[PDB]
Amino acid sequence: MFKVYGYDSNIHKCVYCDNAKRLLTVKKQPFEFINIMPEKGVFDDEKIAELLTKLGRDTQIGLTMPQVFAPDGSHIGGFDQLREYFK
């Protein structure tokens, strides 16, 4: 299943979050959303922590959301980046 790290609407807004969700549905793939910001204060270091490790072993200065991850456990990217995953 695909894993998306971004916003929904209750805590934070997101226009590209909905668009992408449609992309998958169009391809017929199992996936689920995950709110990286469970609190209006700060994102969830728990999910954000494992995320950082998911990509590699460095840092991301300005990483945008939502961040998706392949079922097997890999960094796919956003829409365009993921579109490549689909093709």
Side-chain angles (χ1 to χ4, degrees), residues 6-15 17-18 33-41:
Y7 300 104
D8 37 304
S9 161
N10 198 353
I11 311 85
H12 202 52
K13 73 173 211 248
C14 60
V15 287
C17 69
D18 232 77
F33 206 75
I34 315 168
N35 51 277
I36 62 163
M37 172 123 48
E39 216 188 276
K40 297 186 271 168

Side-chain angles (χ1 to χ4, degrees), residues 11-75:
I11 311 85
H12 202 52
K13 73 173 211 248
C14 60
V15 287
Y16 267 96
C17 69
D18 232 77
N19 314 339
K21 178 213 159 220
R22 179 176 90 162
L23 201 199
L24 284 129
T25 309
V26 179
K27 263 261 143 216
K28 203 126 286 195
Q29 264 294 267
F31 76 83
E32 249 97 344
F33 206 75
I34 315 168
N35 51 277
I36 62 163
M37 172 123 48
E39 216 188 276
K40 297 186 271 168
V42 188
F43 333 137
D44 206 315
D45 286 48
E46 302 184 338
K47 272 148 201 73
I48 292 306
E50 71 201 44
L51 202 183
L52 288 175
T53 310
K54 220 146 171 100
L55 319 96
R57 302 201 218 69
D58 70 352
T59 178
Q60 39 195 59
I61 183 63
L63 224 307
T64 40
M65 280 113 306
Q67 285 253 95
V68 194
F69 277 90
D72 242 23
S74 294
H75 200 207

